[PDB]
Structure formats: structure tokens, C-alpha cells
Amino acid sequence: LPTIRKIAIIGAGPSGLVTAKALLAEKAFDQVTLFERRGSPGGVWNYTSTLSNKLPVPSTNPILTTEPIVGPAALPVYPSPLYRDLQTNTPIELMGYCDQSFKPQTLQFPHRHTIQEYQRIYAQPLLPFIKLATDVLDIEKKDGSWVVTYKGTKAGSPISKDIFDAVSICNGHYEVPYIPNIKGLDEYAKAVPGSVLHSSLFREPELFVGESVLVVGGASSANDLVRHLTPVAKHPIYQSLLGGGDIQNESLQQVPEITKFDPTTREIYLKGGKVLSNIDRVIYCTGYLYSVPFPSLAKLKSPETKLIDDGSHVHNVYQHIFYIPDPTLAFVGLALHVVPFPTSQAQAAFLARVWSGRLKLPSKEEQLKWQDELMFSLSGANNMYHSLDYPKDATYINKLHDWCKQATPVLEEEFPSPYWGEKERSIRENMWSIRAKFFGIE
Amino acid sequence: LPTIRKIAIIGAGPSGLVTAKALLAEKAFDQVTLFERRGSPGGVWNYTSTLSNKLPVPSTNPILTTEPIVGPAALPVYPSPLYRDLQTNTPIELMGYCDQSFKPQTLQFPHRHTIQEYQRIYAQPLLPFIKLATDVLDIEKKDGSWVVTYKGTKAGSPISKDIFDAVSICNGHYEVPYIPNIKGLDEYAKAVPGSVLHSSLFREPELFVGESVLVVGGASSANDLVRHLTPVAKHPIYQSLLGGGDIQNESLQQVPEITKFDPTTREIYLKGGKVLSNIDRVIYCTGYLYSVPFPSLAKLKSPETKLIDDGSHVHNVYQHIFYIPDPTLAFVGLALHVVPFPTSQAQAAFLARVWSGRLKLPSKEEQLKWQDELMFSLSGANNMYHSLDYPKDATYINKLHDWCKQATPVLEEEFPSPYWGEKERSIRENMWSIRAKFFGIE
Numbered sequence A, B: 001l002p003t004i005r006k007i008a009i010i011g012a013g014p015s016g017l018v019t020a021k022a023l024l025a026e027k028a029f030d031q032v033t034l035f036e037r038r039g040s041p042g043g044v045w046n047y048t049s050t051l052s053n054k055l056p057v058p059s060t061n062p063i064l065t066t067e068p069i070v071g072p073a074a075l076p077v078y079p080s081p082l083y084r085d086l087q088t089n090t091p092i093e094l095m096g097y098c099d100q101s102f103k104p105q106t107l108q109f110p111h112r113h114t115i116q117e118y119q120r121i122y123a124q125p126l127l128p129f130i131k132l133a134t135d136v137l138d139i140e141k142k143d144g145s146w147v148v149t150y151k152g153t154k155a156g157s158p159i160s161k162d163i164f165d166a167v168s169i170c171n172g173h174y175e176v177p178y179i180p181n182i183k184g185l186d187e188y189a190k191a192v193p194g195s196v197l198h199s200s201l202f203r204e205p206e207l208f209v210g211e212s213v214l215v216v217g218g219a220s221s222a223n224d225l226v227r228h229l230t231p232v233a234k235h236p237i238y239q240s241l242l243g244g245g246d247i248q249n250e251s252l253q254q255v256p257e258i259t260k261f262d263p264t265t266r267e268i269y270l271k272g273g274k275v276l277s278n279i280d281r282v283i284y285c286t287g288y289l290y291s292v293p294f295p296s297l298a299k300l301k302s303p304e305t306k307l308i309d310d311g312s313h314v315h316n317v318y319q320h321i322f323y324i325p326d327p328t329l330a331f332v333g334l335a336l337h338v339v340p341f342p343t344s345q346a347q348a349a350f351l352a353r354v355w356s357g358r359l360k361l362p363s364k365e366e367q368l369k370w371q372d373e374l375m376f377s378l379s380g381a382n383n384m385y386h387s388l389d390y391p392k393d394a395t396y397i398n399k400l401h402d403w404c405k406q407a408t409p410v411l412e413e414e415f416p417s418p419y420w421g422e423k424e425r426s427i428r429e430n431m432w433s434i435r436a437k438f439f440g441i442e
């Protein structure tokens, strides 16, 4: 409904928060409301000693309902995947929003305390705009607007409904765990509670002292876990990569993917006949699934209207943002392999100028073309759909930055679009090396 | 056994940590070992979304065993009483150890994230000296040394024993809750789970939106809760003080102490015939009890040898530190109404120089005199035994600072003793006013 006045933002995490600030900066909307199931903003940067109560093993359904921990004495808690000693894998020179720097003397790859404090400070001015401890149940286009159904998170809260001209989903994509359905795993898991875990459950490494562990995966979660487990777990630590690996030392034994778990002998069979036994813990660091747990959106199955299928990505989103069929529905934060805060801010700035009419999206067919060209380049690798590994991310943000400058009319105060110059790009290109040197590794 | 070589430190919180650094700085001990049940150091500055599982109501037994939250997927968690939005009530100019300042741009009364990060940085170099996830079961003088019995915190850990020449208990005193045994309370509590809470269970204020609450107490926990509940709880918030209070506005109603809870009408009777009804939450902000949960120490009942009785304080500790009967047993962190970090450091510096022989304690009778004079001044108010409200704390720390200077011989590197000059004392005297202005209150 072009003239947009009332906007609903689903999620008060880093993406939702920056989206709110960008929208409010347009000085064109009458109502900007954020919905958050947690008692506080900041998304995953809400460290919780509390673990998810029921980890589905295996896990391939991207719809899976998130079950918070409830009690008569506390507000419902939604566990965050952050672990106790976590430090960022993104340097301070790049990871913050462009209009809020880190205090002087911050470590280049700070502890999560620093980022949680950063988010706390960022969210402060937006608290009166957020409906905290409120779980959005569903979203759907009814009549000429969007109807978002939500229920206060507390026991006994009534189910409510409100309508908006636009809805920005910033619900995050690191909540629903992804554990491949291997033959025998389920049984192997239910026979010994605690024998099979997912990275989202890791908190304190002292739990693994003396234990023989198998880390399954080969990305940041896997490599980080292997590192944190090295000084405590029984040597060597095993790591199952898809296509094996080369590292075969005393403390680390990279092996090929898993074929099946033998529940009786509790043996683990790896592609290539390789067999493992006496594994105390199997920790799945296999990532997550994208999720759109909203009935009216999840039922959409047709190629032209669907949003989610296998959870490898969110479909039909021009520039990973605007729902092609109806641009009054957008997403912020879907990007993979990026520096989160700056990337979501880049999208937010663009999103705001488009919903306030100060910018126009290309035609619908041209948007669909953009998608067709993307799918083609993916070569069937749909889980790479939202991946913007450098230099894609730098190009992407600078593209949005330049598009935003075209907005008219010019406002007295223009919400900033980040831009990565030669200096920034360089850091982003050697990011993992700069990180390795910081933690004295590799 | 005068020549002390092996020291055991119970607790790896702010007190235990500074005790360790002071001891190691004497370069006179062969072994300094810290025991900590939590998976990490920092004591209460380990924010836990997890609540204590079983809150005893009422609670007057200072022996009460602390039951951590266990699961097959995680290390046992010992809940900390810190709440989500907590900020310090001690200014940065005074609260840190004298040899570790806060980063520039830190708020005068920072969020707990800052303090948790501060403690993380402080504890780092001591990790190899700490036995993490290890619960000390008991402590006792057998033969010529102390035998500390401990059990790894994980399921299946074996009970172990080690002997030391000295033991420093830094187990903290804000764990065992204190809830007076009011008539009817127990029943009133068990009939409606969640109706009666203790400040140690407070985490997120959104749980109380729309609820009618009764805050019981009149110190920092009570005043802070009332403040945090004001913008969400049903107006007015009731506060039961011992002797009533004067504030009787729209949002706050101070009333006198409680006489009994009527389980049937669920009414609350306050001294003076005043009666309350329809109270959804009763939150006890009545403090904690001191605790020495070690069998061989708790059985000690005689006036000359006892350590704990009603939990109002720890008995027979010269200068609140050295166990008079046997100075090889000491305590750090017992002080009440002080700025914790500096005060424990002051004790630690003194403690180290005494256990390394570089300082001598006065005679046993003179120590007992010190105690007799203290008890006399208390006028039967035993829970004020360890209270060092300004100017007592300033005097105390400066006394220890000056005593420590007498140590001989002088070492190349002398672990520092904090000292509060005119400038520091002034801040400490107007501390609560400086705080009130900071949070724009009172």
C-alpha cells in the first residue's frame, strides 16, 4: 500500500534494532513497533546459562517451534547459542554499526561481554518502541494490510492482533538446529541422553574433561569447539569433515563424513570404511536452518510465492530483502558469511528509503531476473543463496550505500549507510588471518 | 605450622582471586590452589538466566546445601543472584582493585557486563592455579595440617582429599537466602508456587507487568527492586519496612513489617493491624546468611572455637580474617557495607604478609580482646559484626595498608595495599548521593 505509515518489526536483535533506527530516521512513519519474545533486546547477545530443553535429533524441519524454558518464578527464557568464553570472529574495525564505535582499548576480537554491552547501549533509546516478552504467532496479508498475531510471553497472556502497512522480519537464522538424518543417529541419541549435542548447547568446556569427543563440521563452530576442547577433552579430538581433512596429529584427527551410528556397538561409521568407537560426545557443529514459523507464510508453497522449503535459505527475496510478490514484507539479516551489524544496517538504510517512497525498486520482472541469475550461479547449492563471502559483501554494501545516496529529498539528518573503502576491504579479505594472528593460531 | 608452603583457597570469586595474587606475590609459597564449583572464576559476576531450583521458604538455616542445576548436556550451574539490568551501586573511582583500573569511558556505575569483563581479565592469569568445577566438601585440621575434601563437580567425579598448611575461605556470603519464619508463610508459599520470591531469584522485571507486588526489606535489594518494578508492576508497589516508612504516594506505599500470612484468605497482616490482600508477588529482599558448609567446621559449637551459629556473622575471626584458635584458617570477604574488591584486597595483602612470616599477629589474648571490644559495641546486634560502614571501612583499609608497609624484608615487587586519601574518603562518604545523582533519583 505504497504510502506506508505503520511498520511492524519482528525481532529486537541487532537486525531488528538497526532496522528500527533507520525507519524512524525517515521521519515518515507514524508507528514503528518491534516485537521480541525475549525479556530484552540484543538477540543472541543475551548469554544464557540455560540450555534448550529439547534438542531435536536429527533436525531437518525448518518450521520447528522454539520452546522456551518456563517456571513459576521467572519470565520465559529463550536460550542463546553463545558459549561462555566466546570472543568475536569479526574485528572491531568492521563489526559495529558505522555510527557507534567501540570504547577505546577494546580488544580487536572482544569477549561477548563487550558486544552484549554494545547492543545494550544501542537498544536503550528504542525500548519504548519495543513490545518485550511478546511472541509473534503469525503474519498474513488480509484485506489491504498485514495482520500480525502475537501473544504476550507470560502464562495467561491473551492472543492479540494488529495491522500494519509493512512487516520487517528480523527473526534471525541461528535458532533451529541442523542435524542431518543419519541412519541410527536418533536411536544412538535417545539411548544415552547427552551423548549427542549440537553446538547451540555448548556453554562450558569443563564438562568434557577426560571425554573422547567427535566434532562434526568444518566451519567456525567446529573449528572453535575443537580449539576450546583441546586443553580439556581426551586426546585426540575427532573431527568429521565432508570430504575428510588433512590434519592427523596427536590432539586432532580429521576424518571423513558419517554414514551411520551403530546403536548396539555404539560405533560410528565414516565414509571410507573408517570406524569410531567409545565416543563419549558427538557434537554437531553443522549449523542451522532458516525459519519462517508463521502459518500464513509457511503454507505458501508455489515457486512464485514461497518463502521457505528445506530451510537452506529464504526464497523470493529481491536483494535478500524484499518479498518479490509483495514488497511490503521484507527481511533483514539473512546474509551469510558477512559481518552482521554493518550488513544489516546497509539493508536497513536501503529498506527505509524504499518504504518511505524516497527510493523506487526496479520492476517486478527485473527483480525476478535478479533472482533467476542468482539461482543459476548457485548451481543447485541453495544453501549458498544468501552467502556474500568477500568480495560479495563489500560490493553489496557499497552498492546499497550508493543507491541510498540517490534518495530524495535530502533530509536534515540522513541515517548513515556504511561504506567499505580500500582500508576496510583489506581487513575483510584477510579477516581470518588477522583473527588467527590475534588468537595466536593456525 | 608457621612455615606455610601449601595454601588452599576456597572460592574463585573476587575475594579468592585477589587472595591468590597477594599470596603468589610473596614468592614464599610452593603451592597456591583455588577451588571453584563453578565452571569459571568471578563469583557472582557470572550472570545466570538460570534460577535456583528450590528456594527454601522460610530460610534461617545457614548450613543449607546449595543445589546446582544439572543436566546431561551441561556442566552443573550454580545460579548467581545478579539480575539482568543490574548496574553497580559502587562508583568506578573506588570499586576496582588498586592495580587494575577500568577502561576509559566506563560509566561511573557501570552495567554488570563491565564488571564481569573486569573480573574475567583479572582472573585470566590465575586459571592454571584454579581447580574449576570442583566443590569443596569439607575442611578439617587433622594431624599437623588441613585436609580439604573435594569432589569434581561432574556426575561421576570421585571424592578426593589434599592437605595444606593454610586454608583461606572466600566462599562468599550472598548465597544462602534469609527469609524470616513468619507464621503462615510456608503454607502461603506452597499453595501458590511463584507467589513468594527472594531477591536472589529476580532476573527480568517484565514478569511482573500488571502484577501487584510486595517488596519486603529496606536496603539496596529492596530499593532497587522497587525502582525496577515501578514502570511495570501494578501501582502501587508495597514495601514492608521494619518500623514502617514515610513514603505513601501513588506508585509506592511503604508499610510496617509482617506479622503473618493468612493462607485461606491469602491476606498479609502487617504490624499495626494493617492488612494486605490480592498480592500477586511477595519478594523477600531480606538479605542472606553467612555460611560455612563444611562439616568439621560447622560442628564446632563452643564459644572459643565456633565459626557459625545463626548465620548473622562468622565468629572468632581476628580483624574479620584470622580464626583466633588457629590462624592457619582465614577468611577474606566477610565485610559488610563496604566496597568489596578494595576491601578484600586490603585483607589479602595483610593475610599474605602474615602467612609468609613477614608480619606477626598480636598475641592470642590481645586478639580475643579485639573481639570482646567488638561484641560489646554491637550491643547484641550480631548481624552488624562484620559491618564497616564508612568511616569504619576507610579506617580499616588504611590500617591494613599501614601495617603491610611494616612487612620485612622489602621485596622487589610489593603486592599493593589500597589506601583511601581525602579524595577517596569523600566519595565513599557521599557514595549513595553520588549514585542517586547518577541514576537521577531520590
Ligand SMILES: Cc1cc2nc3c(=O)[nH]c(=O)nc-3n(C[C@H](O)[C@H](O)[C@H](O)COP(=O)(O)OP(=O)(O)OC[C@H]3O[C@@H](n4cnc5c(N)ncnc54)[C@H](O)[C@@H]3O)c2cc1C
Binding pocket: A010, A011, A012, A013, A014, A015, A016, A017, A035, A036, A037, A038, A041, A042, A043, A044, A045, A078, A081, A082, A083, A087, A088, A089, A090, A095, A134, A135, A136, A137, A170, A171, A172, A173, A174, A332, A333, A339, A340, A341
Ligand atoms: C555461536 C554464535 C557466535 C556468533 N559470533 C559472532 C561474532 O563474533 N560477530 C558477529 O558479528 N556475529 C556473530 N554471530 C552472529 C549473530 O547472528 C549476529 O551478531 C547478530 O545476532 C545478528 O542478529 P539478528 O537480529 O539478525 O538475529 P538474532 O540475534 O538471532 O535476533 C533475533 C531476535 O528476534 C527474536 N524473535 C525471533 N522470532 C520471534 C518471534 N516469532 N516473536 C518474537 N521475537 C522473535 C529472537 O528471540 C531474537 O531476540 C554469532 C552467532 C552465533 C550463533
Ligand SMILES: Cc1cc2nc3c(=O)[nH]c(=O)nc-3n(C[C@H](O)[C@H](O)[C@H](O)COP(=O)(O)OP(=O)(O)OC[C@H]3O[C@@H](n4cnc5c(N)ncnc54)[C@H](O)[C@@H]3O)c2cc1C
Binding pocket: B010, B011, B012, B013, B014, B015, B016, B017, B035, B036, B037, B038, B041, B042, B043, B044, B045, B078, B081, B082, B083, B087, B088, B089, B090, B095, B134, B135, B136, B137, B170, B171, B172, B173, B174, B332, B333, B339, B340, B341
Ligand atoms: C545482587 C547483588 C549485587 C551486587 N552488586 C555489587 C556492586 O555493584 N558492587 C560491588 O562492589 N559488589 C556488589 N555485590 C557484591 C559482591 O558480593 C562482590 O562484588 C563480589 O562478588 C565479592 O565476592 P567473593 O569472592 O567474596 O564472593 P562470591 O562472588 O560470592 O564468590 C564466591 C565463590 O566461591 C565459590 N564457592 C563457595 N563455596 C564453595 C565450595 N564449597 N566449593 C567450591 N566453590 C565454592 C562460589 O561458587 C563462588 O564462585 C553484589 C552482590 C549481589 C548479591
Ligand SMILES: NC(=O)C1=CN([C@@H]2O[C@H](COP(=O)(O)OP(=O)(O)OC[C@H]3O[C@@H](n4cnc5c(N)ncnc54)[C@H](OP(=O)(O)O)[C@@H]3O)[C@@H](O)[C@H]2O)C=CC1
Binding pocket: A086, A087, A088, A089, A090, A174, A180, A199, A216, A217, A218, A219, A220, A221, A222, A224, A240, A241, A242, A257, A258, A285, A286, A287, A288, A337
Ligand atoms: N568465535 C565466534 O564468535 C563464533 C561464531 N560463530 C558464528 O555462528 C554462525 C553459525 O556458525 P556454524 O554453526 O559453524 O555454521 P556453518 O553453517 O558455517 O557451519 C556448518 C558447517 O558444518 C559443515 N557440515 C554440515 N554437515 C556436515 C556433515 N555431515 N559432516 C561434516 N561437516 C558438515 C558444513 O559443510 P559445508 O561447508 O560443506 O556445507 C559447514 O562447514 C556463523 O555466523 C559463525 O560465524 C560460530 C562459532 C563461533
Ligand SMILES: NC(=O)C1=CN([C@@H]2O[C@H](COP(=O)(O)OP(=O)(O)OC[C@H]3O[C@@H](n4cnc5c(N)ncnc54)[C@H](OP(=O)(O)O)[C@@H]3O)[C@@H](O)[C@H]2O)C=CC1
Binding pocket: B086, B087, B088, B089, B090, B174, B180, B199, B216, B217, B218, B219, B220, B221, B222, B224, B240, B241, B242, B257, B258, B285, B286, B287, B288, B337
Ligand atoms: N544495584 C546493585 O548493584 C545492587 C547491589 N546489591 C548488593 O547486594 C548485597 C546484598 O543486598 P541486600 O539483599 O539488600 O542485603 P541487606 O542484608 O542489606 O538487606 C536486608 C535488609 O532487609 C531488611 N529486613 C530484614 N528483615 C526484614 C523484614 N522482616 N521486614 C522488612 N525489612 C526486613 C533489613 O533491615 P535492617 O536494616 O533493619 O536489618 C535490611 O535493610 C549488598 O552488598 C548490596 O549492596 C543488592 C541489590 C542491588
